[PDB]
Amino acid sequence: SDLNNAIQGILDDHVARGVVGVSLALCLPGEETSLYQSGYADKFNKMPMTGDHLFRIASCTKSFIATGLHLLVQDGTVDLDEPITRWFPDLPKAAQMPVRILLNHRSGLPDFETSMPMISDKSWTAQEIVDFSFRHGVQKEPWHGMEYSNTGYVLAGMIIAHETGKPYSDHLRSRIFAPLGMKDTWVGTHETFPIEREARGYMHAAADDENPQWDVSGAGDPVDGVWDSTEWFPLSGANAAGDMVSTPRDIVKFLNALFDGRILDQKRLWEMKDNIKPAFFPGSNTVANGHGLLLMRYGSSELKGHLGQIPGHTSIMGRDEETGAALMLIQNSGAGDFESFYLKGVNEPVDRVLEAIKNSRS
Ligand SMILES: N[C@@H](Cc1ccccc1)C(=O)O
Ligand SMILES: [Ba+2]
Ligand SMILES: [Ba+2]
Ligand SMILES: [Ba+2]
Numbered sequence: 001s002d003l004n005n006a007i008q009g010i011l012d013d014h015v016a017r018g019v020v021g022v023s024l025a026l027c028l029p030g031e032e033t034s035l036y037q038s039g040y041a042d043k044f045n046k047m048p049m050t051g052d053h054l055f056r057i058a059s060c061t062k063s064f065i066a067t068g069l070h071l072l073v074q075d076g077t078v079d080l081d082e083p084i085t086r087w088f089p090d091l092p093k094a095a096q097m098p099v100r101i102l103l104n105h106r107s108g109l110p111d112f113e114t115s116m117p118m119i120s121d122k123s124w125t126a127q128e129i130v131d132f133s134f135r136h137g138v139q140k141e142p143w144h145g146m147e148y149s150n151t152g153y154v155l156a157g158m159i160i161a162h163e164t165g166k167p168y169s170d171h172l173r174s175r176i177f178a179p180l181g182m183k184d185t186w187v188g189t190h191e192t193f194p195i196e197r198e199a200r201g202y203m204h205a206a207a208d209d210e211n212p213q214w215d216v217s218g219a220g221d222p223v224d225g226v227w228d229s230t231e232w233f234p235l236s237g238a239n240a241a242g243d244m245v246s247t248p249r250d251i252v253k254f255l256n257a258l259f260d261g262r263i264l265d266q267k268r269l270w271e272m273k274d275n276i277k278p279a280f281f282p283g284s285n286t287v288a289n290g291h292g293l294l295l296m297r298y299g300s301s302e303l304k305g306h307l308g309q310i311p312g313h314t315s316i317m318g319r320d321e322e323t324g325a326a327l328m329l330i331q332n333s334g335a336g337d338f339e340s341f342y343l344k345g346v347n348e349p350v351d352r353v354l355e356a357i358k359n360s361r362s
């Protein structure tokens with residue numbers, strides 16, 4: 001179709017801007033999921049990007065962790081409004097933190113990401129990350145305002161572990177991946193995924209990478225303007241805040257089932273996508289968030305989903321609630337600065353795709 005050529009062109013043009021490669025899973029109303037790729041999964045071996053290449057989806061992990069927690073609220077063992085002192089009695093301010101505050105980025109919890117070395121071989125535990133956050137981060141008052149929190153989801157992950165007697169991956173696998181037949185999806189803290197299948201991730205030496213968000217000391221020298229950042233950071237360091245590996249195809253399966261009421265009951269789905277307040281994420285299109293989903297605005301269209309940034313893999317997932325269109329776009333190019341083209345520019349082909357869908361629909 002014409003939409004097919006228009007979408008493929010949008011991807012080609014984005015790769016031609018300097019992006020190494022891009023993989024898209026798009027699902028439209030009345031149609032099967034269609035996959036598109038452009039550019040490379042491996043820059044130096046010139047291996048074409050396929051719809052089978054795996055990516056680190058970074059904080060899109062957070063939508064699955066929120067889902068995991070909402071499922072436990074349904075099981076009846078967790079209450080969104082109960083104080084987390086039940087699980088973390090000695091966590092400062094825990095009494096002023098209901099369970100939901102872990103999911104909505106208004107907890108005021110000290111964060112770890114800006115302090116955590118991206119280049120290491122260090123294995124992390126959940127508690128260790130929490131300790132590291134209170135050591136190096138700044139705590140604000142619960143409900144102070146919106147400030148993106150990774151710590152919140154590490155704590156959510158620990159509630160899941162406590163309430164299920166097992167790693168959070170087992171709960172996510174048994175309750176989300178298996179039922180949906182998501183065969184190309186792993187939780188990197190607790191599970192081994194096959195690296196040979198993973199698209200390589202590239203960090204760009206770029207002029208607009210002025211204020212890097214990560215400690216990337218020890219990168220060594222760039223080859224051909226890039227670093228192969230794929231195995232820089234051990235996923236245990238992101239834990240429940242961003243440790244998942246998946247394909248666009250697998251992600252779009254999840255989005256469809258979530259929004260089609262096939263995972264969470266109506267009330268918990270509503271908590272996730274509809275019980276919203278204003279939200280900000282630097283460089284992004286984010287305008288609001290619920291309890292596990294960001295609302296991201298693209299002109300006259302909006303995605304309910306998430307963004308992901310982990311060295312070299314830059315992802316956008318979401319459902320457009322108006323048209324029923326679901327998507328996951330992941331490029332294997334990135335940088336450190338939130339406002340760098342290689343990070344914030346991922347929003348450009350997403351914007352263009354949504355206006356191409358909209359144009360074929362008029
Ligand atoms: N902050 C990243 C996820 C992440 C958390 C912690 C460490 C590394 C990566 C994101 O929003 O996608
Ligand atoms: Ba600087
Ligand atoms: Ba390493
Ligand atoms: Ba509109």
Ligand SMILES: [Ba+2]
Binds near residue numbers: 359361
């Ligand atoms: Ba038209």
